[PDB]
Write a protein that binds this ligand. Structure first.
Ligand SMILES: *[C@H](CS(=O)(=O)c1ccccc1)[C@H](CCc1ccccc1)NC(=O)[C@H](CS(=O)(=O)CC1=C(C)NO[C@H]1C)NC(=O)N1CCOCC1
Length: 217
């Protein structure tokens, strides 16, 4: 395994998105993971429709649109639906709408997804380095997370009780401090141009390795 990985350098990560008033973080996390696999299997990088997940992957998948959801069941919907539209063809309106999926504008599919073992940051590391960006839930309930601007985020009061779906796009070491490179969906103004480095190998800090999963085309 390389000492550090940054899938952005590999052109496998789309622009940072802004969820606005809608709490569809779970949706952005899922599409983000899939966008990387799409680029890896076709050479083309295209933003996938988060709105498509918000409107179509609902109750049957335990998801509540702007009120929360799961990245894994999001993947399950894409498998059952046999496709997901592109962001351009099904734009993000930041609100629950009636499902408007159109197979004519399908931009990607999903064959299956993998769930990683709870709390194993070593297995997550391997997945990030060999498979690609991984969807994860983290405890982002503390003010320190919102006010973050640079460096490696460490919050002594973080728990493994996750509530926020994000994407791990890499890992590295900064001044001896190990970290996970996390892509957020709160716009370019949050943290480092929309990204945040979280303490790595510090006993599953903020539950980042509690429930990881990634899709496969
Ligand atoms: C996005 C989170 S957020 O708005 O960025 C945020 C930021 C700072 C503090 C708190 C939240 C979703 C917000 C849901 C929401 C909206 C309005 C009011 C309350 C809550 N959160 C999620 O959708 C979250 C994703 S997760 O935690 O990764 C899902 C997983 C769980 C719960 N455990 O393992 C996971 C991977 N999911 C949920 O909150 N829920 C799942 C579906 O049922 C409802 C709750």
């Amino acid at each position: 395994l390389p000492d550090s990985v940054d899938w952005r350098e590999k052109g496998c990560v789309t622009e940072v998105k802004y969820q606005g008033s809608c709490g569809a973080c779970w949706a952005f996390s899922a599409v983000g993971a899939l966008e990387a696999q799409l680029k890896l299997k076709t050479g083309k990088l295209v933003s996938l429709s988060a709105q498509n997940l918000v409107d179509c992957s609902t109750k049957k998948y335990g998801n509540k649109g702007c009120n929360g959801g799961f990245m894994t069941t999001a993947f399950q919907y894409i498998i059952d639906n046999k496709g997901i539209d592109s962001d351009a063809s099904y734009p993000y309106k930041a609100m629950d709408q009636k499902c408007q999926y159109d197979s004519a504008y399908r931009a990607a599919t999903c064959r299956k997804y993998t769930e990683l073992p709870y709390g194993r940051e070593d297995v997550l590391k391997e997945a990030v380095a060999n498979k690609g960006p991984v969807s994860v839930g983290v405890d982002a309930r503390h003010p320190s997370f919102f006010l973050y601007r640079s460096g490696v985020y460490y919050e002594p009061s973080c728990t493994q009780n996750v509530n926020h779906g994000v994407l791990v796009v890499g890992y590295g070491d900064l001044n001896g401090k190990e970290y996970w490179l996390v892509k957020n969906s709160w716009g370019h103004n949050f943290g480092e141009k929309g990204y945040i480095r979280m303490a790595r190998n510090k006993g599953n800090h903020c539950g980042i390795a509690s429930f990881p999963s990634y899709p496969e085309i």
